[PDB]
Structure formats: C-alpha cells, structure tokens
Amino acid sequence: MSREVKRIGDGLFVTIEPANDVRANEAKVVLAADNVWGDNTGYQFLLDADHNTFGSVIPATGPLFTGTASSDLYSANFEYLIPANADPVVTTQNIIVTGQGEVVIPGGVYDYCITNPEPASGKMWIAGDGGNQPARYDDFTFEAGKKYTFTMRRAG
C-alpha cells in the first residue's frame, strides 16, 4: 500500500511558522524534498478546496493511482498544486525532487495528499505516514496568516 524499501518508506514532517508576506485571508504551503529516495524521484502536493475528495478521489489507503490516469484527474478535483503544473502522470517532471515549491492558498478547509511518482513501479504513490503528519488527510484546516512547510524524508 505504500512504497517501501527494507520496510522503510517515506514520510511527512510538518513545520508551521507565522506567515508575514501574504494576505490576511491567505496561508502558504511549501513542499520540500532533497532526493529522498536517492533516485531523483519526487513529489507533488494536491489540494482540494472543496474538501470532498478524501474517500473517493483520494483513496483512504494505497496509492493515488497505478499506471495511466485520466488526464483531468488533477484539473477536475484539486484547485491548488505544487508544483503548479503538477499533472497525473507517473513519468512527469512536474515534481519537487530537490529544493522546494510553494503555493499561496485561501485559509480554509481542504482535503490533501502528497504524491510520489515512481516510474520503476508504475505507481503514483501517496507518501507514507511514518512522519509526524499523515500524507493524506480529510478536512485539514490551513489557517490564514500561517506558513506550513511539509518536508519529506525517509521514515519507518
């Protein structure tokens, strides 16, 4: 259900700071990664402002999809994305491999998941839950005036 090597997968480590560079009704989300799996595989952050995708478009367990996806899997369901041109393709380069990408979003309620495309296995995996925050989430509140940094690392 999760990508793992030697029973060691990956995970999400969240940091929140005051955001002082956005509007009063805005939050900032950052996705940071540093070649976590050593193979130039990366990550995408998917945000649904309608928070109605958990359990249907975002599966409660297992990868987001395998193999081929409908070309509108993101454009129909997720309003905000990191990177901004993130697309539902396992082979895409529209991923955060090293460094970070960001998105400024309304304060509000969201469903989200973080993906880790792996061409070698044909899976658009959702990242593991071995960090301090689940990598998929139903009705998370991103509060205005705050900056959420989601840092990806290897985890149990």
Residue numbers in the entry: 360 to 440, 441A, 442 to 515
Publication passage describing the model:
Porphyromonas gingivalis is a major pathogenic oral bacterium that is responsible for periodontal disease. P. gingivalis exerts its pathogenic effects through mechanisms such as immune evasion and tissue destruction, primarily by secreting various factors, including cysteine proteases such as gingipain K (Kgp), gingipain R (RgpA and RgpB) and PrtH (UniProtKB ID P46071). Although the structure and function of the catalytic domain and some K domains of gingipains are known, the structure and function of DUF2436 have not been characterized.
We recombinantly expressed the DUF2436 domain (residues Ser361–Cys579) of PrtH (UniProtKB ID P46071) from P. gingivalis in Escherichia coli. In this study, the DUF2436 domain of PrtH from P. gingivalis (PgDUF2436) was determined at 2.21 Å resolution, revealing a noncanonical β-jelly-roll sandwich topology with two antiparallel β-sheets and one short α-helix. Met516–Cys579 were not modeled in this structure because of very weak electron density in this region. The size-exclusion chromatography result indicated that PgDUF2436 exists as a monomer in solution. Analysis of the electrostatic surface charge of the PgDUF2436 structure reveals the presence and location of negatively charged patches. The negatively charged patch on β3, β5, β8 and β9 is formed by Asp407, Asp409, Asp431, Asp446, Glu438, Asp497 and Asp498. Although the structure of PgDUF2436 was determined by the molecular-replacement method using an AlphaFold model structure as a template, there were significant differences in the positions of β1 between the AlphaFold model and the experimentally determined PgDUF2436 structure. However, DaliLite search results using structure-based alignment revealed that the PgDUF2436 structure has structural similarity Z-scores of 5.9–5.4 with the C-terminal domain of AlgF, the D4 domain of cytolysin, IglE and the extracellular domain structure of PepT2. Collectively, these results demonstrate that PgDUF2436 exhibits a novel structure with a modified β-jelly-roll sandwich fold topology.
